[PDB]
Amino acid sequence: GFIGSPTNLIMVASTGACLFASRFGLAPSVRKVAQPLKLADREVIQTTGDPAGFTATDVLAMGAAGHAIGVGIVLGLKGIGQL
Amino acid sequence: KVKIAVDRNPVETNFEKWAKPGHFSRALAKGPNTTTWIWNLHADAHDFDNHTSDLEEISRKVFSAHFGQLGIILIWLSGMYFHGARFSNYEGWLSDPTHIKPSAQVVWPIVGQEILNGDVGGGFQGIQITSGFFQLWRASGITSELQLYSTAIGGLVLAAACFFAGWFHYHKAAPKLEWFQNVESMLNHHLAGLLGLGSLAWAGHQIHVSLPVNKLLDAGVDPKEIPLPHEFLLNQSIIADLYPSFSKGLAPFFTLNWAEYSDFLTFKGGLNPVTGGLWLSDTAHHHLAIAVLFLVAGHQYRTNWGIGHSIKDILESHKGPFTGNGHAGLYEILTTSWHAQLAINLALFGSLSIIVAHHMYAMPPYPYLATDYGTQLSLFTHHMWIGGFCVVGAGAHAAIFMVRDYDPTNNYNNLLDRVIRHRDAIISHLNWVSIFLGFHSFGLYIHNDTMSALGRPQDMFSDTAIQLQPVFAQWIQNTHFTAPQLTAPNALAATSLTWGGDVVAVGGKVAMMPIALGTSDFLVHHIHAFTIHVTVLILLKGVLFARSSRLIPDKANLGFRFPCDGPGRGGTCQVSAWDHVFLGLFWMYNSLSIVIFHFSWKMQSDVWGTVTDSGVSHITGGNFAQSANTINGWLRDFLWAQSSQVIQSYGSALSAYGLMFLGAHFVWAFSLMFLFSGRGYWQELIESIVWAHNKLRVAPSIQPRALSITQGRAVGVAHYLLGGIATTWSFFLARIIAVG
Amino acid sequence: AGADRPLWSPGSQPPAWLDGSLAGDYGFDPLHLSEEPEMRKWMVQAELVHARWAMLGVAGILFTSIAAKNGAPFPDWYDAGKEAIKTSPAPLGSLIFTELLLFGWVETKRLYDLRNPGSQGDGSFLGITDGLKGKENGYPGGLFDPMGMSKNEASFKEAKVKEIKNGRLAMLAFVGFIAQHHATHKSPIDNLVDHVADPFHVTFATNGVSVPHFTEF
Amino acid sequence: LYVGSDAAALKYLDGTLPGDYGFDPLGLLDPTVSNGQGAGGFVNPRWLQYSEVIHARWAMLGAAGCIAPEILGKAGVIPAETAVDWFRTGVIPPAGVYKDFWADPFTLFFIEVVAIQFAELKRLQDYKNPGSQSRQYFLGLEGLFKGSDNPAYPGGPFFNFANFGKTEAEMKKLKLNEIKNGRLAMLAMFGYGAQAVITGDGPFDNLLAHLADPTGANLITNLGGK
Amino acid sequence: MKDFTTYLSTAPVVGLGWAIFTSGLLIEINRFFPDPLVFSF
Ligand code: CLA
Ligand code: CLA
Ligand code: CLA
Ligand SMILES: CC1=C(/C=C/C(C)=C\C=C/C(C)=C/C=C/C=C(C)/C=C/C=C(C)/C=C/C2=C(C)CCCC2(C)C)C(C)(C)CCC1
Ligand SMILES: CC1=C(C/C=C(\C)CCC[C@H](C)CCC[C@H](C)CCCC(C)C)C(=O)c2ccccc2C1=O
């Protein structure tokens, strides 16, 4: 919440890591399918200038995932007495 | 892919089909000629699978019928709120809930029934209600009758809106088959919106309205002097005084410092000593966590945006080596058959109702709910019976799906085919398990009764002679008593008082206390398991042998609901799956009757009572440890020791319970003539009456006929269930109101 | 007198049974009543008698209230029966049953003229043949129309339209009488003077009824 | 440019609508949705466009009526007692009610509901039956209610008495600008309601607070964050 | 109207009408004649 707080830093890092994972393979996305690996799919939604398969629902889903991972990490570290 | 598919005006709103009673089926479209047509009019009314073979029309009818049932439910809820608004002493009950009985039904003085308006207290006369609506309204922050009036008017408005919605979504804008088949969208919207959004809205109401009103009520201030909920909503000074964390003003939520919300979102597991109910802050954090979990779960399935899970892909992927085609054709089955979904919904709804009853007697989630013993007993019994009816209807509609909607082409080597392929082994093993359970439980009871009648108390299976103590249940109780100690250290106390601890009492009456488990408890628990096993065996034999059997190889062609196949092969009476459900209904009734008898006796002997300086004096003095081990103990110390209030209720406000008890005995006895006998006797009797009316030239044009064998069985089981249910209802309510 | 006639709502489709022949036919029928010709005749007769009694009662109420406001000792239209049989030579019971006996003849003659048109004017009642014959469904005429301005067809139609419009207006006037006497407990003329004295303040919203006041803020 | 146009949504809509930026993620302009005859459901393209333009006009009027009193009362144009916040006029008596009015607020509500019921019921009857309000005599202004083929743009001697847009290009530009300003005012009234709930002040006061201190007065600082 | 009238002319609806009529008649008789047992004019 506070600018410069450790929770802000690590949750911004988590959201950016989720976005970077969605941009380049890694995390499954709209254009990524199949259970074991990730395979190319239909474009589904126009990306509106974004290269590769990166649409609005992609950034919405992975921002939600990043916020969830960040709040889980924050509360887990607060439970164990860490940052 | 997922989109709204709606046809515009497929059915015109005309009264021309209201004049013709039999119109949905071609068999009844020809008009009536015998009286068995009339029953057939009231039997195939909701059999939409038989009226048309088109799944789209059936789905539209199902949607409209669900809207109608929601409208009926909202009408009933609005009427309940209106009765609480006008013909009730809720305002008087709020001043002293431990001395004024809850009353919300008032009778008209016409023929001497005004004696039913008993002295409930607070300057009011009426019937002592056991629904617990007073405690629900106290948990919702309702103070004045104006709020109940507003809730009733809003309920009537929403009921009219739902009734118009059913008319619109059937006659005007009827959804197509592709709209109903979007199971992924339905699941996502139900998990996120129906359950999660409602949980979040109720959590917000508990935070902003229910918690301050309940805190001020527990403080002991006048309910008339309590500020209105909108004052808590708008002005922040009162909510800051009652809870300092509200002075932050949503700062800890968006800064992830949620521990600052710990004052009004607590984890003090247990019972509130002021009111004997669950902590409202605990319920607020509970519903908030449930809402968060359900909004997380509602984004699981793929609908229109690529990401998500496919139900068909998940079902086809989960295949093992011992099962062949693991869960292969189930997605096509559950997206085309309404009866399979009905069976699933009814089974899960009934099991969840049983869970609700158990976890509601265990933790009373309402202020001044545990002190009202009658409310708790009535709620437990009601949810118990509704759950049992739902789980037997699950087997009924599963058998209906087996007869009608099963396709062998889509089921070659899948799980359903293998279940049908070893159904005989399933039924044989279940029969052996049921017989062994019934022997080693009921024969144990008979052993105790015999050795009691033979003067051998040391030979009995009691708490003093042969200790067959429930060591697993006692170990689990001890572990859950230590759950806040080591495994859940953030909880202030135990999650419930049933595991152990101290005695919580309100107004001199014990709200909750630890429950000891002995040999009688083990005996009745194994008896319940045996009865459930037998009912499961009956319903599973009905479901699995619904299509074919060794006795009848072409049972599928005879339909789901047929009386018999003649006296051939020795006799094929009651061989249909419908007759199996009709037989299992009695076993469900017996099982739940024994369960509620165990609940009533155990909580009257070891839970409920009064609290004095010497200790806790229970209602029956704790005879369950020494009387529940024999059938004669239930006969004398539970059925004869109680039920004296029912028979002595004449001349008082409880006399309607005695009259209802007698009427229930009457209906239960009257059911036996339909359960026994047959059809030819009554048919010839009706022929003689036809001759009598023909002598006087008053023979009706519609030929009177005897009830069908299936119809006679249905009438018998319905009157039998109604008689037994109302007998237990009257006995329980009269006993728990007079002495409770 | 039909087809392109002003309706209750501009653009709404008029009902098939409401062709505009009847007086005051604005095609107003949300519940689709009076579809059958016999049901239409019964509804027309009921509307006509309700209209005549409503206009008579509203005129009497207005005259009594105007005289009371002018200074004449007349009671309010509400609870006038109490002082009425307090000062009546005829007590209650006898008066209402005498009224019922006097009304039964007229009501049953109206009913059997509605069921059988022209059957009353056959000399059965004091040898009257030309009179006591219904000119129309709900419009008897004869001795009930002493002066003959209903002989002209166009004049009769205009009189029917005027009568049904003033009847509907008097129906709403009587409903308003009941409503604002239950709301204000004053005479309708008192409500009229209060409305024309301070129109900007005195209205249906300042009586303490109709609109509820809970928070008072 | 198409502002965030979702793919597979252009398959059923071409460029005929004024805005028509191709943004339809869930999908409601599809002719397959509510296809048939008669009244049908409420999700049809004609009613969708009609409700969109009516929401646009109402939101534009609301944004104007929320800005003008506060802005003119900040200066000497509007006196201070009449320069109340838009939610403190009496629309929400918990928020605030202006007692010094020429009539009671419920009397004004009754006059308003009668007038707007006449207006919107005539509008609805013309929507169901085009040109029907010009036939039945209303006051003599029936020729002013002639309407057009599109119910969203009736025109006539009163609704468009300036007869702007003689050419089709000017009609298209005017319709696009109307729907754009209406969508902007819809988002504006959304923000106005949000600020009224959170800040409890007028939108111009919130704008001045953001202007004076950007970081010290923003959405993050509104709810307690830093 | 006539279709709704024939719906009201069906046996359950007229039976319901008879039920309310008879029940209301007996209830009003019992209310205005409180608890009689023997016919004594
Ligand atoms: C998040 C959105 C949402 C919500 C809240 C609901 C809610 C509901 N659905 Mg629905 N459903 C949805 C989306 C949603 N649906 C979608 C997208 C589909 C298509 C895939 C379906 C398909 C569907 C079927 C096929 C059926 C339901 C049924 C039901 C009801 C279940 C009974 C119950 O729990 O009573 C809860 C009751 C209440 C809480 C009382 C208030 C109910 C209000 C009026 C509903 C308001 C939510 C509504 C969806 C808003 C949109 C409607 C709007 C145009 C007016 C419930 C009202 C069943 C039904 O017909 O019930 C009538 C049923 O058989 N749903
Ligand atoms: C569904 C549940 C729910 C609801 C309705 C509320 C609602 C509220 N809570 Mg609560 N709260 C909740 C859950 C909920 N909360 C939960 C789960 C927690 C976690 C512990 C809290 C914790 C909490 C705290 C600690 C506090 C509140 C406060 C508030 C108020 C502030 C609202 C606000 O700023 O939000 C944001 C609201 C908006 C952005 C407004 C929505 C946008 C509007 C509606 C747009 C309208 C536009 C429209 C078109 C124009 C108007 C139309 C008109 C012209 C006709 C409000 C009454 C605070 C309070 O009471 O002080 C005032 C407070 O101190 N709540
Ligand atoms: C109290 C009466 C009674 C009794 C004893 C039984 C007994 C039985 N029924 Mg049931 N049943 C009853 C009433 C009863 N029924 C009624 C009223 C209905 C109508 C709804 C049904 C409907 C019904 C169905 C639908 C089914 C059964 C089944 C069964 C069997 C389950 C075996 C078991 O678990 O217990 C074991 C048996 C006992 C505990 C009997 C008690 C007697 C003593 C303890 C046994 C020893 C006696 C003595 C020591 C030996 C004497 C030897 C010599 C002198 C004769 C068993 C034969 C099921 C079945 O076939 O098997 C699973 C089944 O599917 N019954
Ligand atoms: C590179 C680039 C760029 C940038 C971009 C960006 C920077 C973005 C971002 C984005 C973002 C940054 C987003 C986010 C989102 C988020 C979200 C969506 C989240 C969440 C939500 C919610 C609603 C939540 C909830 C919750 C709660 C409350 C509780 C529980 C848990 C959770 C967390 C789940 C640009 C354009 C310039 C250019 C080009 C490229
Ligand atoms: C008695 C009996 C009959 C005969 C029962 C018949 C014909 C049903 C009679 C139902 C009556 C007509 C219901 C209505 C009774 C009253 C006339 C209605 C209430 C009257 C009061 C309100 C005055 C069967 O047909 C039968 C069939 C199969 C198994 C068992 C039996 C069985 O036991």
Query: Could you write out the DSSP letters of every residue in B600-659?
Result: HHHHHHHT-EEE-SS-EEESS-STHHHHTTSHHHIIIIITTSSSHHHHT-TTSTTHHHHH
Which amino acid is present at B154?
G
Pick the atom of ligand 4 nearest to B296's CA: 34
Q: Is the CB of B442 under 6 A from ligand 3?
A: yes
Q: What are the beta bridge partners of residue D159?
A: none
Two tokens, residue A9: 């830093």
* Burial classification of residue B458, based on how many CB atoms lie within 10 Å of its CB (0-12 exposed, 13-18 middle, 19 or more buried): exposed
H/E stretch holding B6 reads strand B6-8
Contact: B256, A57; criterion CB under 8 Å: no
Contact: B257, A2; criterion CB under 8 Å: no
Residue to mutate among C35, C40, C41, with most E CBs inside 10 A, is C35
Interface size, chain B vs chain D, as Cβ–Cβ contacts under 8 Å: 66
H/E stretch holding B119 reads strand B118-119
Q: What is the stated resolution of the deposited model, in angstroms?
A: 2.8
Q: Is the CB of B443 under 6 A from ligand 3?
A: yes
Residue B233 CA, ligand 2 centroid: distance in Å: 9
Alpha carbon separation from D114 to B100, D107, D117, E1 (Å, rounded):
49, 11, 5, 33
The CA-CA-CA angle for residues C109, C110, C111, to 5°, reads 90
Rounded to 5 degrees, what are φ and ψ at B616?
-100, 115
How far is residue B664's CA from residue B589's CA, in Å, rounded to a whole number?
15
Place of tokens 């909510």: B239
Two tokens, residue B563: 């009386």
Q: Is any Cβ of chain D less than 8 angstroms from the Cβ of A12?
A: no
Count of positions (residues) in chain B:
740
Closest residue on chain C to B227 (Cα): C215
How far is residue D7's CA from residue D9's CA, in Å, rounded to a whole number?
5
Two tokens, residue D18: 């004024």
Q: What are the beta bridge partners of residue B7?
A: B174, D35
Two tokens, residue C48: 């006509």
Q: Tell me which DSSP letter residue B195 carries.
A: I
Hey, how many other C-beta atoms are within 10 angstroms of the C-beta on E37? 5
DSSP string, B464-528: SSS----HHHHHHHHHHHTIIIII-TTSSS-S-SSSSS--EEETTEEEE------HHHHHHHHHH
The ligand placed nearest to the CA atom of residue B187 is 1
Contact: A3, D5; criterion CB under 8 Å: no
Query: Which technique was the structure solved with, according to the deposited record?
Result: cryo-EM
CB < 8 Å to B143, chain C: none
Tell me which residue of B228, B227, B213, B243 sits closest to B141, measured CA to CA: B213
How far is residue D211's CA from residue B564's CA, in Å, rounded to a whole number?
86
Pick the atom of ligand 1 nearest to B198's CA: 39
How far is residue D38's CA from residue D49's CA, in Å, rounded to a whole number?
18
* Residues 6+ positions from A14 with CB-CB distance below 8 Å: A66, A69, A70, A73
How far is residue D56's CA from residue D181's CA, in Å, rounded to a whole number?
8
Residue among C9, C211, C217 minimizing CB distance to D93: C217
Q: Is any Cβ of chain B less than 8 angstroms from the Cβ of E32?
A: no
Render the burial of D174-206: b for 16+ CB within 10 Å, e for the rest.
ebeebbebbbebbebbeebeebbeeeebbbbbb
Residue B66 CA, ligand 1 centroid: distance in Å: 10
Contact: B256, A71; criterion CB under 8 Å: yes
Residue with CA nearest ligand 2 atom 1:
B201
Residue B317 Cα, gap to closest chain A Cα (Å): 10
CB < 8 Å to E3, chain B: 14-16, 18-19
Residue B201 CA, ligand 4 centroid: distance in Å: 24
Residue among B255, B296, B317 minimizing CB distance to A2: B255
Residue among D97, D107, D125 minimizing CB distance to C9: D125
Q: Is the CB of B438 under 6 A from ligand 3?
A: yes
Instruction: Say how many domains are in chain E.
Output: 1
Q: What are the beta bridge partners of residue B342?
A: none
β B6-8/D35-36 pair status: parallel
Render the burial of B437-454: b for 16+ CB within 10 Å, e for the rest.
bbeebbebbeebbebbee
Render the burial of B360-396: b for 16+ CB within 10 Å, e for the rest.
bbbbbbbbbbbbbbbbbbbbbbbbbbbbbbbbbbbbb
Which of D54, D187, D197 has most ligand 2 atoms within 8 Å of CB, for mutation? D197
Grouping H, G, I as helix, E, B as strand and the rest as coil, residue B254 is helix
Q: What are the beta bridge partners of residue B512?
A: B504
Interface size, chain C vs chain D, as Cβ–Cβ contacts under 8 Å: 45
E to A contact (≥3 Cβ pairs closer than 8 Å): no
How far is residue C1's CA from residue C23's CA, in Å, rounded to a whole number?
9
* Host domain of residue E6: 1-41
Residue B705 CA, ligand 5 centroid: distance in Å: 10
Task: Enumerate helices (H) and strands (E) in chain A, giving the number of each.
Answer: 2, 2
Calculate the CA B329 to chain-centre distance: 31
Contact: D224, B10; criterion CB under 8 Å: no
β B6-8/B173-175 pair status: antiparallel
Q: Cβ < 6 Å from ligand 4: which residues?
A: A 15, 59-60, 63-64, 67-68, 71; B 292
Which amino acid is present at B318?
H
Q: Quick check: B18 and B187 in contact, CB under 8 A?
A: no
Which amino acid is present at B288?
L
| Sign of the four-CA dihedral B245, B250, B256, B261 | positive
Q: Quick check: D187 and D176 in contact, CB under 8 A?
A: no
Q: Is any Cβ of chain A less than 8 angstroms from the Cβ of D7?
A: yes
Grouping H, G, I as helix, E, B as strand and the rest as coil, residue B174 is strand
Which are the residues after which chain E is interrupted (C to N > 2.5 Å)?
Answer: none
Two tokens, residue B375: 């409310």
Two tokens, residue B185: 């969208």
Q: Tell me which DSSP letter residue D82 carries.
A: G
Residue B208 CA, ligand 2 centroid: distance in Å: 10
Q: What are the beta bridge partners of residue B703?
A: B34
Grouping H, G, I as helix, E, B as strand and the rest as coil, residue B125 is strand
How big is chain C by its Cα radius of gyration, in Å? 22
Rounded to 5 degrees, what are φ and ψ at A62?
-80, -25
Two tokens, residue B29: 């479209």
Q: Is the CB of B653 under 6 A from ligand 2?
A: no
Calculate the CA D25 to chain-centre distance: 23
Two tokens, residue E23: 């029940």
Contact: A2, D25; criterion CB under 8 Å: no
Q: Is the CB of B63 under 6 A from ligand 5?
A: no
Q: Is the CB of B233 under 6 A from ligand 2?
A: yes
DSSP string, B39-51: HHHHHSSS-HHHH
How far is residue B495's CA from residue B128's CA, in Å, rounded to a whole number?
31
CATH code, E28: 1.20.5.510
Residue D85 Cα, gap to closest chain B Cα (Å): 17
Two tokens, residue D212: 């004076």
β A39-40/B616-618 pair status: unpaired
* Residues 6+ positions from C37 with CB-CB distance below 8 Å: none
Two tokens, residue C146: 């002493």
How far is residue D205's CA from residue D192's CA, in Å, rounded to a whole number?
11
Residue B180 CA, ligand 1 centroid: distance in Å: 12
Hey, how many other C-beta atoms are within 10 angstroms of the C-beta on B501? 16
Q: Is the CB of B670 under 6 A from ligand 5?
A: no
Two tokens, residue E22: 């008879």
Pick the atom of ligand 4 nearest to B292's CA: 30
* Burial classification of residue B712, based on how many CB atoms lie within 10 Å of its CB (0-12 exposed, 13-18 middle, 19 or more buried): buried
Q: Is any Cβ of chain C less than 8 angstroms from the Cβ of D147?
A: no
Which amino acid is present at B20?
K
Q: Is the CB of B182 under 6 A from ligand 1?
A: yes
CB < 8 Å to A44, chain B: 305-306
CB < 8 Å to B255, chain A: 1-2
